Design an enzyme around this catalytic site. Structure first.
Site, PDB file in Angstrom:
ATOM      1  CE  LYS A   1      47.589  62.967  60.393  1.00  0.00           C
ATOM      2  NZ  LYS A   1      47.871  64.311  60.933  1.00  0.00           N
TER       3      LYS A   1
ATOM      4  CB  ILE B   1      40.249  68.795  65.965  1.00  0.00           C
ATOM      5  CG1 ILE B   1      39.493  68.096  64.831  1.00  0.00           C
ATOM      6  CG2 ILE B   1      39.328  69.150  67.106  1.00  0.00           C
ATOM      7  CD1 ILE B   1      39.140  66.678  65.140  1.00  0.00           C
ATOM      8  CD  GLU B   2      47.162  70.641  64.884  1.00  0.00           C
ATOM      9  OE1 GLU B   2      48.082  69.849  65.187  1.00  0.00           O
ATOM     10  OE2 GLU B   2      47.257  71.888  65.013  1.00  0.00           O
TER      11      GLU B   2
ATOM     12  CG  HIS C   1      46.974  69.497  50.661  1.00  0.00           C
ATOM     13  ND1 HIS C   1      47.505  69.586  51.912  1.00  0.00           N
ATOM     14  CD2 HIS C   1      47.816  70.169  49.856  1.00  0.00           C
ATOM     15  CE1 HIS C   1      48.695  70.150  51.843  1.00  0.00           C
ATOM     16  NE2 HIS C   1      48.940  70.438  50.590  1.00  0.00           N
TER      17      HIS C   1
ATOM     18  CD  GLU D   1      39.254  63.592  48.138  1.00  0.00           C
ATOM     19  OE1 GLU D   1      38.119  63.502  47.614  1.00  0.00           O
ATOM     20  OE2 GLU D   1      40.267  64.008  47.520  1.00  0.00           O
ATOM     21  CE  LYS D   2      44.100  65.206  57.318  1.00  0.00           C
ATOM     22  NZ  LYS D   2      44.800  66.412  56.812  1.00  0.00           N
TER      23      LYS D   2
HETATM   24  N1  LIG Z   1      37.395  65.012  55.653  1.00  0.00           N
HETATM   25  C1  LIG Z   1      37.983  65.841  56.523  1.00  0.00           C
HETATM   26  N2  LIG Z   1      37.578  65.794  57.824  1.00  0.00           N
HETATM   27  C2  LIG Z   1      38.189  66.558  58.771  1.00  0.00           C
HETATM   28  N3  LIG Z   1      39.237  67.369  58.529  1.00  0.00           N
HETATM   29  C3  LIG Z   1      39.629  67.413  57.237  1.00  0.00           C
HETATM   30  C4  LIG Z   1      39.044  66.684  56.195  1.00  0.00           C
HETATM   31  N4  LIG Z   1      39.640  66.996  55.007  1.00  0.00           N
HETATM   32  C5  LIG Z   1      40.600  67.878  55.324  1.00  0.00           C
HETATM   33  N5  LIG Z   1      40.606  68.152  56.665  1.00  0.00           N
HETATM   34  C6  LIG Z   1      41.572  69.040  57.328  1.00  0.00           C
HETATM   35  O1  LIG Z   1      42.482  68.176  58.022  1.00  0.00           O
HETATM   36  C7  LIG Z   1      42.904  68.836  59.207  1.00  0.00           C
HETATM   37  C8  LIG Z   1      43.404  67.852  60.234  1.00  0.00           C
HETATM   38  O2  LIG Z   1      44.483  67.105  59.707  1.00  0.00           O
HETATM   39  P1  LIG Z   1      45.959  67.233  60.273  1.00  0.00           P
HETATM   40  O3  LIG Z   1      45.959  67.145  61.779  1.00  0.00           O
HETATM   41  O4  LIG Z   1      46.773  66.309  59.453  1.00  0.00           O
HETATM   42  O5  LIG Z   1      46.336  68.767  59.949  1.00  0.00           O
HETATM   43  P2  LIG Z   1      46.959  69.324  58.577  1.00  0.00           P
HETATM   44  O6  LIG Z   1      46.044  68.977  57.449  1.00  0.00           O
HETATM   45  O7  LIG Z   1      48.356  68.877  58.454  1.00  0.00           O
HETATM   46  O8  LIG Z   1      46.885  70.873  58.928  1.00  0.00           O
HETATM   47  P3  LIG Z   1      46.831  72.081  57.866  1.00  0.00           P
HETATM   48  O9  LIG Z   1      45.447  72.695  58.066  1.00  0.00           O
HETATM   49  O10 LIG Z   1      47.916  73.037  58.300  1.00  0.00           O
HETATM   50  O11 LIG Z   1      47.032  71.470  56.500  1.00  0.00           O
HETATM   51  C9  LIG Z   1      41.629  69.521  59.665  1.00  0.00           C
HETATM   52  O12 LIG Z   1      41.842  70.535  60.609  1.00  0.00           O
HETATM   53  C10 LIG Z   1      41.004  70.003  58.366  1.00  0.00           C
HETATM   54  O13 LIG Z   1      41.384  71.335  58.082  1.00  0.00           O
HETATM   55 MG   LIG Z   2      45.807  69.995  55.674  1.00  0.00          MG
END
Ligand SMILES: Nc1ncnc2c1ncn2[C@@H]1O[C@H](COP(=O)(O)OP(=O)(O)OP(=O)(O)O)[C@@H](O)[C@H]1O
Ligand SMILES: [Mg+2]
Length: 265
Positions: free
Chosen positions: A256, A8-9, A38, A35-36
């Site tokens: 997020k 997902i996004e 990158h 943590e998110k």
């Molecule tokens: N702790 C986490 N839990 C879930 N997703 C995470 C996590 N850390 C990183 N992610 C990433 O964050 C994405 C969702 O965030 P968002 O909708 O902001 O997309 P994005 O990070 O901008 O997309 P891209 O994959 O192109 O960088 C997820 O699809 C996953 O790949």
């Molecule tokens: Mg990302």
């Protein structure tokens, strides 16, 4: 691609989402912020085909041909393969399952960048099934000056789901506590761990603006700090996201927050 399940996004918190989370009662329940990372979206699949099974790997847009070069991830396939087998065995034993049609371990492929003069670039080279090799030193998953994590490639697990039948509609998502319990038993699996736990509002109060990524220190680089090496942000989720009693409210329980410094890049 019939075995592929898109991840997902995740949205920033909207007015309507927050209002619905409160009205439904979900906001007052238990949430975590983790943590998110990158990197790039990655999935490790174990697919049952009766008395045999197969391991497959996916990027954002689908399961990959085994000879697609994708950020050197082949360097981790032996590890991933041992790990996913262990996870499947744990799940079958604990849940009393003879077979798991599809097991999906989703996470972030990350790293291969750490611009500190005391941290050499990776000397490793991956090998594809066709014999071609690529240097991990040539891998650039992201161009941003922060966050930077490690000179080596890594995988940060953030979700586990399994479908006994294999059908998409039968996926069962592990809750946070179960996700951590199982992940902690998979040898050398890095996984999302709660930075804060509490109500939705308690998690939303997490200080993302000053949150330095803890991953470099976890990956051996505590003596080699990079100035301004802020984490991307956090993902906040209900600890029982995916449970029917949560899902019945028809409100997404994942959001997020990003640091402003990252957004400005
Ligand atoms: N702790 C986490 N839990 C879930 N997703 C995470 C996590 N850390 C990183 N992610 C990433 O964050 C994405 C969702 O965030 P968002 O909708 O902001 O997309 P994005 O990070 O901008 O997309 P891209 O994959 O192109 O960088 C997820 O699809 C996953 O790949
Ligand atoms: Mg990302």
């Amino acid at each position: 691609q019939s075995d592929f399940s898109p991840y997902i996004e995740i949205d920033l918190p909207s007015e309507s989402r927050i209002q619905s989370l409160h009205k439904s009662g979900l906001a007052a329940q238990e949430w975590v912020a983790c943590e998110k990372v990158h990197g790039t979206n990655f999935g490790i699949y174990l697919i049952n085909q009766g008395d045999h099974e197969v391991v497959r790997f996916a990027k954002r847009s689908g399961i990959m041909d085994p000879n697609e070069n994708f950020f050197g991830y082949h360097i981790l396939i032996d590890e991933f393969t041992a790990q996913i087998r262990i996870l499947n065995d744990l799940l079958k034993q604990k849940y009393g399952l003879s077979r798991v049609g599809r097991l999906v371990l989703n996470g972030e492929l990350f790293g291969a960048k750490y611009k500190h003069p005391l941290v050499p670039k990776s000397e490793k080279w991956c090998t594809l099934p066709n014999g071609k090799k690529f240097p991990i030193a040539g891998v650039q998953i992201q161009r941003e000056p922060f966050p930077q994590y490690s000179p080596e490639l890594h995988f940060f697990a953030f979700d586990i789901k399994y479908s006994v039948s294999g059908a998409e509609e039968d996926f069962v998502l592990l809750g946070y506590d179960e996700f951590v319990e199982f992940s902690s038993k998979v040898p050398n699996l890095l996984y999302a761990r709660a930075l804060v736990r509490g109500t939705l509002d308690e998690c939303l109060a997490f200080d993302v603006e000053n949150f330095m990524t803890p991953l470099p220190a976890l990956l051996g680089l505590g003596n080699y700090p990079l100035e301004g090496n802020l984490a991307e942000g956090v993902v906040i989720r209900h600890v029982r996201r995916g449970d029917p009693a949560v899902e019945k409210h028809n409100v997404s329980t994942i959001i997020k927050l990003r640091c402003s410094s990252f957004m400005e890049l």
